[PDB]
Design a protein around this ligand. Structure first.
Ligand SMILES: CC(=O)N[C@@H]1[C@@H](O)[C@H](O)[C@@H](CO)O[C@H]1O
Ligand SMILES: CC(=O)N[C@@H]1[C@@H](O)[C@H](O)[C@@H](CO)O[C@H]1O
Ligand SMILES: CC(=O)N[C@@H]1[C@@H](O)[C@H](O)[C@@H](CO)O[C@H]1O
Ligand SMILES: CC(=O)N[C@@H]1[C@@H](O)[C@H](O)[C@@H](CO)O[C@H]1O
Ligand SMILES: CC(=O)N[C@@H]1[C@@H](O)[C@H](O)[C@@H](CO)O[C@H]1O
Ligand SMILES: CC(=O)N[C@@H]1[C@@H](O)[C@H](O)[C@@H](CO)O[C@H]1O
Ligand SMILES: *[C@@H]1O[C@H](CO)[C@@H](O)[C@H](O)[C@H]1NC(C)=O
Ligand SMILES: *[C@@H]1O[C@H](CO)[C@@H](O)[C@H](O)[C@H]1NC(C)=O
Ligand SMILES: *[C@@H]1O[C@H](CO)[C@@H](O)[C@H](O)[C@H]1NC(C)=O
Ligand SMILES: *[C@@H]1O[C@H](CO)[C@@H](O)[C@H](O)[C@H]1NC(C)=O
Ligand SMILES: *[C@@H]1O[C@H](CO)[C@@H](O)[C@H](O)[C@H]1NC(C)=O
Ligand SMILES: *[C@@H]1O[C@H](CO)[C@@H](O)[C@H](O)[C@H]1NC(C)=O
Ligand SMILES: OC[C@H]1N/C(=N\O)[C@H](O)[C@@H](O)[C@@H]1O
Ligand SMILES: OC[C@H]1N/C(=N\O)[C@H](O)[C@@H](O)[C@@H]1O
Ligand SMILES: [Zn+2]
Lengths: 499, 499
């Protein structure tokens, strides 16, 4: 019988009690990254994260930081492999920058052979060290040209451009890459990129944020989400029809959260919690498992929710061999109005829920996850059992999928000095508390989870936050980025992997 | 009788002997800038100077500097107006960033009203201080989308996109702007952007520079130059047919240089010198005055030189109300082979000339203009009489045009500290020596020159050099860019203007 802690102090950092041998022999352990965040612009075209951070610097991060040079994994990819080798990691999730291999967006305009060579070397070096690649085709860094030609995922033109890009990746790298992820966190671009405009490309309704260059927060999230599903599905069908000889697997990445009622004896809060599951997870998992959006979304969103034709439904339903599930935290849900006629209406209001980390009786759900110094009542708190709840829910509700945990991790503040940042015991407690629950759900619920990739391999540019927070298991000095030095968490993870 | 100095020491910094009253009463005096170099990316889309400096950082400058923030004239445009007001300047040349007003390149994709507002405020503030704007529509900063859709000026699609952009500028700002420049230095994009790949977009033949993403240095300069002439001419015809009510004037900007024989008793060097005039100046001035390229270019370049149809010839011939002539220096020319079959052949080799600053008897042409610490035999030297020679030549060869000197200036090294940089006596000597010759040619040759705009208003990002050199008449601290403090040269220029 496995017992896991939900509250500080944690004791799961003792590798005598929790280690890789606690999991099945074949279980993959590693770390994750993405291309905007780590490579730098050298050698690639420009994408919408370049565009957004440069046009709206105060949205790039409080320090106005961006991915121009970052940790320079363009030059120092071997040092990333060395970190993985030091960890004895068996997996590494990274992304391919579309703008590095097809700087002009549309594949007929030519490829960047040097870009292709950069990923070939990375992939070869990973394999030579026994590290299985998990490659994300699209971690948000859309070539700027596509955004400017047709507003990217807002237009159905994205489908074929994304398919031709994907096809080039499978042709060039699929002999060695056997695990592909299509779009990172399907929920995030529609809502943050086209709803709140916190993320690239930064579109929204005028009264949501007057800085947005265009948009409609009420309708565009749905359009973009629908196009993401179609583009994803077209790529999975291409992979499974044209690249079955490579013997690999493909899936989407979901951001997952658990949801609990803000008041667990209040029917209205319970109903909001179930609505959040459908609006946050079912918005994509209903299409992916059934070819349709959830009924509550059909009902509430009405004419703003696109329909799938019968062909599209069939393309999307079942369009995965596995699911990459990212997991960081859980929210309490309570009812909230949905003012659909308000000029500041967003798609995120359609769920009819307000989300918090404190419940009605004043209980904070778990330890601190992210401090927000400008408004401390907006602090995020984590909830280790949420990983158990999410995996259980996916098995039960979503037809027993094969799952890889493709991100899990926690930041520490960029204001800490190097010594403080290296002594990242808060990160060991976060990681180990989640791994304990992950082992527990695999054993108790028989969830088909086959690997875990912690966020992040190293310190990097953090979307929305610049370099004001650090997520790495290895530390990078921004005044001299060559080295990636294992923190206390990296050193702990090394011992967890090889106890 | 006017006597002007050609060699150090100069004495023309004494405003008792040379000042604005030496020139006609109506003569315009001011300074110049360009939008990439001064504004920053905030509030605009991305262009090919963003793309080039980010993809090829070692070509942006030795410091890898770029125009991301620069002197932040987006925020501090009023401080630029204050500099001009302090100078009592009567003119200011600046450029409009296409990517600020039409971030998506093609006007039908929408305009950026806030971008438009930024130039309206600038223009209104200039006029309120009695400063005549001279506005460059295109100072090299092509929206990246156009480069990625069709390779920008490489394709004839540029013509209409540039025309629709220009039309928006005339509609929005032409009620107040009465002097328009179309393309900055017609020679430079074809040769540096598409020949040597020193400049955006960075195309060349593979053996010229293996880093180029595509190109052909032998043919693409000609294609691009031809499209520039067509696009320029289409915009001048639009201005003169549709905006004649505004009562303004439009012209191209030429980079001018004088050329002298490396050996003035050697027929071969004399012939090379005359070939350089045709290949450097006549490449554009033959079309602009006659609708045809020079005969020597027709003969030498052969099938690589595009033809104008009769309609195009007529559009281009006479497509100026004035000429903006930039002038910085003069070269000696000697013969050089033109290996047209060599894989590393460039269009610049077609003139059959090698250019130096030292003649056959060892004479350096004038004072130091730019030191090149990596190869000192590549140092540039200036030649004050060259401004006289150029203006005389334009009057005699090119049908007595109306001329504004739209750039003239000199750098000082970025390694100097602030005190040294403020004590920029070398810049006073450069400026005054040229102004003396400019007054002399107006008086002696009756050249129709009506104003002079020194490069630059302030320190800025220098194409190819980052922040490793300074050109300003006012100093900017890169650790805190708000202020623009007049240097010794700005203070001298103030007294020259108002003696
Ligand atoms: C080398 C080592 O410490 N391995 C330990 C093993 O002894 C322990 O039973 C298991 C519990 O899951 O965790 C692991
Ligand atoms: C997505 C897809 O199913 N299949 C394509 C088919 O259209 C294409 O003709 C063939 C060769 O290009 O490769 C395959
Ligand atoms: C240096 C190191 O830790 N190497 C270990 C190796 O001993 C172990 O057999 C393998 C699989 O568990 O993981 C790796
Ligand atoms: C105020 C002042 O110094 N004005 C001088 C004027 O005296 C002089 O004759 C002229 C020569 O061009 O230069 C100017
Ligand atoms: C370049 C040009 O000559 N003229 C245009 C004409 O085509 C256009 O119809 C009219 C109204 O848009 O404005 C003008
Ligand atoms: C403060 C200052 O210098 N103002 C001068 C003004 O005296 C002069 O009349 C005008 C034209 O020359 O140039 C300006
Ligand atoms: C941040 O920048 C935008 C311009 O993109 C401006 O509209 C907004 O007010 C600024 N935000 C703050 C908090 O100052
Ligand atoms: C607009 O929404 C903001 C946050 O969504 C809210 O504080 C404000 O009341 C809303 N305004 C109206 C008119 O509903
Ligand atoms: C930068 O870091 C690398 C790795 O530690 C080191 O070898 C190199 O000397 C350092 N550079 C400077 C300038 O300190
Ligand atoms: C500069 O960068 C390019 C890659 O864009 C590389 O090909 C070239 O060798 C580097 N130049 C030098 C002098 O190192
Ligand atoms: C290529 O040109 C470079 C400079 O233009 C020159 O030094 C070299 O000789 C040329 N090579 C050939 C094969 O002509
Ligand atoms: C920056 O320069 C401006 C102008 O001199 C000054 O007012 C402001 O205090 C300076 N900022 C800092 C942080 O020094
Ligand atoms: O916020 C941490 C990490 N979290 C993420 N999702 O939750 C992103 O996919 C990744 O790019 C980001 O850096
Ligand atoms: O090199 C000085 C100056 N010289 C220029 N031409 O000669 C450019 O138009 C301008 O952008 C550049 O900064
Ligand atoms: Zn940048």
């Amino acid at each position: 019988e496995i017992t896991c802690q939900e509250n500080l102090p944690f004791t799961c950092g003792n590798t005598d009690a929790l280690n890789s041998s606690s999991f099945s022999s074949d279980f993959i352990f590693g770390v994750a990254s993405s291309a905007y965040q780590i490579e730098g612009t050298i050698g690639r075209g420009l994408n919408i994260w370049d565009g957004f951070t440069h046009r709206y610097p105060n949205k790039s991060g409080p320090d106005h930081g961006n991915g121009d040079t970052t940790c320079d994994s363009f030059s120092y990819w071997q040092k990333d492999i060395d970190v993985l080798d030091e960890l004895n990691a068996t997996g590494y999730r990274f992304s391919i920058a579309w703008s590095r291999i097809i700087p002009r967006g549309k594949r007929s305009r030519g490829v960047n052979e040097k870009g292709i060579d950069y990923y070939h070397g990375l992939i070869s070096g990973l394999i030579k060290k026994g590290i299985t690649p998990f490659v994300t085709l699209f971690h948000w860094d859309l070539p700027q040209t596509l955004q400017d030609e047709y507003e990217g995922f807002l237009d159905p033109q994205i489908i074929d451009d994304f398919k031709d890009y994907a096809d080039l990746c499978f042709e060039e790298f699929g002999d060695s890459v056997k695990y592909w992820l299509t779009i990172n966190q399907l929920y995030s671009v529609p809502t943050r990129g086209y709803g709140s405009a916190l993320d690239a490309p930064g579109r929204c309704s005028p009264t949501v944020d007057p800085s947005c260059y265009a948009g409609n927060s009420s309708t565009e999230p749905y359009i973009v989400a629908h196009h993401q599903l179609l583009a994803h599905a077209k790529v999975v069908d291409l992979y499974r029809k044209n690249y079955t000889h490579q013997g690999g697997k493909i899936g989407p990445t979901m951001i997952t959260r658990w949801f609990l009622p803000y008041n667990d004896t209040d029917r209205h809060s319970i109903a909001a919690t179930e609505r959040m599951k459908e609006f946050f997870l079912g918005w994509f998992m209903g299409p992916l498992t059934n070819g349709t959006y959830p009924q509550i979304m059909i009902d509430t969103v009405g004419e703003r929710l696109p329909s799938f034709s019968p062909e599209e439904s069939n393309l999307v339903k079942g369009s995965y061999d596995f699911l990459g599930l990212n997991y960081y935290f859980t929210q309490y849900a309570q009812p909230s109005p949905n003012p659909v006629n308000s000029t500041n209406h967003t798609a995120m209001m359609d769920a009819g829920a307000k989300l918090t980390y404190i419940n009605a009786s004043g209980h904070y759900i778990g330890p601190l996850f992210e401090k927000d110094k400008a408004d401390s009542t907006d602090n995020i708190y984590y909830y280790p059992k949420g990983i158990y709840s999410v995996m259980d829910y996916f098995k039960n509700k979503y037809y027993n999928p094969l799952i890889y945990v493709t991100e899990n991790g926690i930041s520490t503040p960029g204001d800490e000095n190097r010594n403080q940042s290296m002594l990242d015991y808060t990160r060991i407690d976060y990681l180990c508390s989640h791994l304990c629950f992950l082992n527990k759900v695999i054993k108790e619920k028989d969830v088909n989870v086959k690997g875990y990739l912690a966020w992040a391999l190293g310190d990097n540019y953090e979307f929305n936050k610049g370099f004001t927070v650090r997520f790495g298991l290895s530390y990078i000095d921004w005044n001299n980025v060559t080295d990636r030095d294992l923190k206390k968490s990296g050193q702990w993870y090394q011992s967890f992997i090889s106890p």
